[PDB]
Design an enzyme around this catalytic site. Structure first.
Site, PDB file in Angstrom:
ATOM      1  N   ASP A 215      -5.727   6.457  -6.010  1.00 34.15           N
ATOM      2  CA  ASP A 215      -6.727   5.695  -5.256  1.00 34.15           C
ATOM      3  C   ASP A 215      -6.175   5.196  -3.922  1.00 34.15           C
ATOM      4  OD1 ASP A 215      -9.430   5.117  -5.106  1.00 34.15           O
ATOM      5  OD2 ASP A 215      -9.195   3.096  -5.909  1.00 34.15           O
TER       6      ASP A 215
ATOM      7  N   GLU B 186     -10.312 -13.155 -11.658  1.00 29.68           N
ATOM      8  CA  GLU B 186     -10.247 -13.876 -10.397  1.00 29.68           C
ATOM      9  C   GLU B 186      -8.851 -13.759  -9.800  1.00 29.68           C
ATOM     10  OE1 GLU B 186     -11.823 -17.837 -10.735  1.00 29.68           O
ATOM     11  OE2 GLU B 186     -13.385 -17.206 -12.142  1.00 29.68           O
TER      12      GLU B 186
ATOM     13  N   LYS C 218      -3.612 -13.030 -10.450  1.00 30.78           N
ATOM     14  CA  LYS C 218      -4.833 -12.391 -10.931  1.00 30.78           C
ATOM     15  C   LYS C 218      -5.044 -12.839 -12.374  1.00 30.78           C
ATOM     16  CE  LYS C 218      -6.704  -7.802 -10.880  1.00 30.78           C
ATOM     17  NZ  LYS C 218      -7.146  -6.673 -11.756  1.00 30.78           N
TER      18      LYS C 218
ATOM     19  N   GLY D  48     -12.881 -12.088  -6.811  1.00 36.45           N
ATOM     20  CA  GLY D  48     -12.740 -11.594  -8.169  1.00 36.45           C
ATOM     21  C   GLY D  48     -14.056 -11.077  -8.725  1.00 36.45           C
ATOM     22  N   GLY D  49     -14.084 -10.935 -10.055  1.00 35.04           N
ATOM     23  CA  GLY D  49     -15.285 -10.585 -10.797  1.00 35.04           C
ATOM     24  C   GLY D  49     -15.570  -9.100 -10.930  1.00 35.04           C
ATOM     25  N   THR D  50     -15.940  -8.643 -12.126  1.00 30.06           N
ATOM     26  CA  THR D  50     -15.993  -9.482 -13.318  1.00 30.06           C
ATOM     27  C   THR D  50     -14.752  -9.207 -14.167  1.00 30.06           C
ATOM     28  OG1 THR D  50     -17.432 -10.272 -15.125  1.00 30.06           O
ATOM     29  CG2 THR D  50     -17.202  -7.881 -14.860  1.00 30.06           C
TER      30      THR D  50
HETATM   31  C1  LIG Z   1      -5.196  -6.247  -5.250  1.00 34.42           C
HETATM   32  C2  LIG Z   1      -5.074  -7.763  -5.391  1.00 34.42           C
HETATM   33  C3  LIG Z   1      -5.370  -8.210  -6.826  1.00 34.42           C
HETATM   34  N1  LIG Z   1      -3.694  -8.102  -5.063  1.00 34.42           N
HETATM   35  N2  LIG Z   1      -2.581  -7.687  -5.806  1.00 34.42           N
HETATM   36  C4  LIG Z   1      -1.495  -8.138  -5.255  1.00 34.42           C
HETATM   37  C5  LIG Z   1      -1.875  -8.887  -4.070  1.00 34.42           C
HETATM   38  C6  LIG Z   1      -1.167  -9.577  -3.088  1.00 34.42           C
HETATM   39  N3  LIG Z   1      -1.803 -10.164  -2.100  1.00 34.42           N
HETATM   40  C7  LIG Z   1      -3.123 -10.151  -2.002  1.00 34.42           C
HETATM   41  N4  LIG Z   1      -3.642 -10.816  -0.890  1.00 34.42           N
HETATM   42  C8  LIG Z   1      -4.964 -11.023  -0.538  1.00 34.42           C
HETATM   43  C9  LIG Z   1      -5.225 -11.501   0.747  1.00 34.42           C
HETATM   44  C10 LIG Z   1      -6.538 -11.715   1.112  1.00 34.42           C
HETATM   45  C11 LIG Z   1      -6.864 -12.206   2.495  1.00 34.42           C
HETATM   46  C12 LIG Z   1      -7.700 -13.509   2.424  1.00 34.42           C
HETATM   47  C13 LIG Z   1      -8.409 -13.477   3.799  1.00 34.42           C
HETATM   48  N5  LIG Z   1      -8.701 -12.050   4.046  1.00 34.42           N
HETATM   49  C14 LIG Z   1      -7.844 -11.228   3.170  1.00 34.42           C
HETATM   50  N6  LIG Z   1      -7.506 -11.500   0.247  1.00 34.42           N
HETATM   51  C15 LIG Z   1      -7.222 -11.044  -0.963  1.00 34.42           C
HETATM   52  N7  LIG Z   1      -8.231 -10.839  -1.859  1.00 34.42           N
HETATM   53  C16 LIG Z   1      -9.568 -10.474  -1.368  1.00 34.42           C
HETATM   54  C17 LIG Z   1     -10.241  -9.796  -2.593  1.00 34.42           C
HETATM   55  C18 LIG Z   1      -9.290 -10.128  -3.779  1.00 34.42           C
HETATM   56  F1  LIG Z   1      -9.310  -9.159  -4.783  1.00 34.42           F
HETATM   57  F2  LIG Z   1      -9.618 -11.372  -4.300  1.00 34.42           F
HETATM   58  C19 LIG Z   1      -7.910 -10.159  -3.108  1.00 34.42           C
HETATM   59  N8  LIG Z   1      -5.985 -10.816  -1.360  1.00 34.42           N
HETATM   60  C20 LIG Z   1      -3.909  -9.481  -2.933  1.00 34.42           C
HETATM   61  C21 LIG Z   1      -3.283  -8.832  -3.996  1.00 34.42           C
END
Ligand SMILES: CC(C)n1ncc2cnc(Nc3cc([C@@H]4CCNC4)nc(N4CCC(F)(F)C4)n3)cc21
Ligand SMILES: CC(C)n1ncc2cnc(Nc3cc([C@@H]4CCNC4)nc(N4CCC(F)(F)C4)n3)cc21
EC number: 2.7.11.1
Lengths: 291, 286
Positions: free
Chosen positions: B130, B27, B43, B22-24
Site C-alpha cells: 500500500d 483512535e 493508536k 480515527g474510527g472505526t
Molecule cells: C498511521 C498512523 C496511525 N501513524 N502511525 C504512526 C504515526 C506517527 N505519526 C503520526 N502522525 C500524525 C500527524 C498528523 C498531523 C496532524 C496535523 N496534520 C497531520 N496527523 C496524524 N493523523 C491524522 C489521521 C490519523 F490516523 F489520526 C493520524 N498523524 C501518525 C502515525
C-alpha cells in the site's frame, strides 16, 4: 438470496426420497424419483438458515444452471424449504470413478481413454463458457448405469468464484496497484489449463488407485511444485501402458501453463481419438463391480 | 500472543495531548512520554483481533530508519494501545494538500528514502502493498517513515486463511500451488506503487484518478495496458521520466528491485537530503 430461480416449495411435493446415499460437511445426498415422470434424480441437501453465507452455494447453482452439455450433470432446479436447500441433478447410479475403482481395482487403458475423452468434452464445453472446474479427480467424475460419464461437484469452483467476488468487493482503491496485483484479484492467478493438468493426474489415479505423491505431506507437495526444477509425475509401470498413454500423461502434465494443451487440442490426441472408445467399456467395468 | 504486552494503564506513562483522528478501527493520539518528554503516536484499538495482531508484529519486527519505529503495546480495559514514533507533519498527502506539488528534488529524496525502506522490507520477506502518499509519513526533521501496514497484514492473513482451506493438493497444477503458497505476485508490486506515488507527488493525484475504479481495474488487467506517465513533459528532467518508466515496468519479471532502483540516476544524485523537506515544511507553515 441463494439464487433468483429457487423453488420456494417442498421438494417432497415433486420427488419421493428413495435412499440416503451419504452425508458429511457438504450436507447429504439422496436418490429420489420424480413423482410424475418416474425419472431418478440426485438431491444434494444442505442447511440454509438465516445469516448463513449463501455465496458459495449461490455460485454452485449459477454454474450448474448455465450448463447444457451431455458430459456435465444435468440440473433440474433447486428448492428452499424450511431452511434446507435441495439441489436437484441428474442421477448417476454408479457414483464416482473413485467409488468404483475402490472395488474393482485399476481401470484398463481403454477404459481410462474413454473416461478422458468424455471428461475433455465436458472441459472443452466449460472452458468455452469461461468456466473452470478446478477439481477434476476420480471422486468428481460420475458414471451412470449406462456407462456414460458426467462431471459433477462444482463445490471447489463455486468456493473460488465466491472468494474471487469477495476480493473484488473489498479490493479498495486501485490507482496505486500494480497490474499483476489487479490481475490476481480479478482472475485468480491461473486459468482453465489447470483442469488439463488435473485430468492427467486423474488418469494416473485411475491407472494406479492413488494420485502421485499421495503419501507425501500435502504442504511438502505444494512446496515442491513451486521449485524451479519441479518434475511432472509419470506413470509408474512403464511396460503396462502404451507409448500413447505415456505421451498423454507427458503433454497434459506440461509444467508451464503457457505451453499446456487446451481441452480441444487434447481431444485430438491419439489416446482419446482412437476407435472403439464407447460406454461399453464402462459397462464392462460395472459388471466387474457387481461380479 | 505478543509476549511483551504491557499489562498496565498507558495513561500512567503518557500524557494524551491531542486526538489526531480515527474510527472505526480506533483512535490516534499525539502523546508525550512522562519521563523523557519525547512525543509518540498512540493508536488505541477495540472481535477477531488477529489481523491487528499481525500488523503490530510487522511494526515490532522492523528496525530500520525509514520504517516508523515501534515502542510497545499496552493492554488496559479491553483497549490495546500501540505506541510508535511520532511524525509531526503527518503524511505526504497531508502536506501536499496544503503546499501543492513537490519539486523534482523533493520527490527524488522521498523516493530514495522509500526505496531504502522497501529494500529493507523486501529483505525481511515482507511486502508493503500500500505504498502511496497517504502512507508515507514525515517527521519534524523532514525525515521519511513508511507507515500503515494494515493492508500488508490483511493480505498476509488472507493468504494464510486460503492456505488453511486449500484442501488436498495432489491433483493441483503447479501454477495453482504457487498461487496458494506465494499469492500470485511478489514484492516488485511495491516498486510500481512507488512510481505511481512519484506521479502523485508531482501532480497531486495518481493517474486515472478521475476514472471509475472498476474501469481502472478492467483496463489494468488487459494485455495491452500501457503504464502511465507524467503528464507535463517539459516540467521534469529526463532522469525523472526514466525513473517513472522503469518503476512502472509492466512485466514484473523485468521491473527492477528496490536495491537496483537505488542506483538510478534520479535517486543517486547529490543534494538529496532532509533539508529539501524542511523547505517543504517551511512552505507548509509560512
Ligand atoms: C498511521 C498512523 C496511525 N501513524 N502511525 C504512526 C504515526 C506517527 N505519526 C503520526 N502522525 C500524525 C500527524 C498528523 C498531523 C496532524 C496535523 N496534520 C497531520 N496527523 C496524524 N493523523 C491524522 C489521521 C490519523 F490516523 F489520526 C493520524 N498523524 C501518525 C502515525
Ligand atoms: C456429487 C453428488 C452431490 N452428486 N451430484 C450429482 C450426482 C448424481 N448422482 C450421484 N450418484 C451417487 C451414486 C452413488 C452410488 C451409491 C452406491 N455406490 C455409489 N453414491 C453417491 N454418493 C455417495 C456419497 C454421496 F455424496 F452421498 C453421493 N452418489 C451423485 C451426485
Amino acid at each position: 438470496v441463494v439464487d433468483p430461480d429457487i423453488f420456494n416449495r417442498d421438494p417432497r411435493d415433486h420427488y419421493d426420497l428413495l435412499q440416503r446415499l451419504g452425508g458429511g460437511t457438504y450436507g447429504e445426498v439422496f436418490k429420489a424419483r420424480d413423482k410424475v415422470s418416474g425419472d431418478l434424480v440426485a438431491l444434494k441437501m444442505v442447511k440454509m438458515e438465516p445469516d448463513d453465507d449463501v455465496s458459495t452455494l449461490q455460485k454452485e447453482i449459477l454454474i450448474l444452471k448455465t450448463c447444457r452439455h451431455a458430459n456435465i450433470v444435468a440440473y433440474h432446479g433447486s428448492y428452499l424449504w424450511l431452511q434446507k436447500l435441495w439441489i436437484c441433478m441428474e442421477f448417476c447410479g454408479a457414483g464416482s470413478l473413485q467409488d468404483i475403482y475402490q472395488v474393482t481395482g485399476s481401470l484398463s487403458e481403454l477404459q481410462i481413454s474413454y473416461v478422458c475423452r468424455e471428461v475433455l468434452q465436458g472441459l472443452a464445453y466449460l472452458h468455452s463458457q469461461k468456466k473452470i472446474h478446478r477439481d477434476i479427480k476420480g471422486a468428481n467424475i460420475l458414471i451412470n448405469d449406462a456407462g456414460e460419464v458426467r462431471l459433477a461437484d462444482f463445490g471447489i469452483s463455486a468456493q473460488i468464484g465466491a472468494e474471487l467476488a469477495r476480493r473484488l468487493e473489498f479490493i479498495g482503491t486501485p490507482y496505486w496497484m500494480a497490474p499483476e496485483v489487479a490481475a490476481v484479484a480479478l482472475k485468480g492467478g491461473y486459468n482453465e489449463l489447470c483442469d488439463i493438468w488435473s485430468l492427467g493426474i486423474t488418469a494416473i489415479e485411475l491407472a494406479e488407485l492413488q494420485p502421485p505423491l499421495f503419501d507425501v505431506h500435502p504442504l511438502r507437495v505444494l512446496f515442491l511444485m513451486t521449485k524451479s526444477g519441479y518434475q511432472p509425475p509419470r506413470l509408474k509401470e512403464k511396460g503396462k501402458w502404451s507409448a500413447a498413454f505415456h505421451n498423454f500423461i507427458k503433454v497434459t502434465l506440461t509444467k508451464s501453463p503457457k505451453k499446456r494443451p487446451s481441452a480441444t487440442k487434447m481431444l485430438s490426441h491419439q489416446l482419446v481419438s482412437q476407435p472403439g472408445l464407447n460406454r461399453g467399456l464402462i459397462l464392462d467395468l460395472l459388471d466387474k463391480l457387481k461380479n
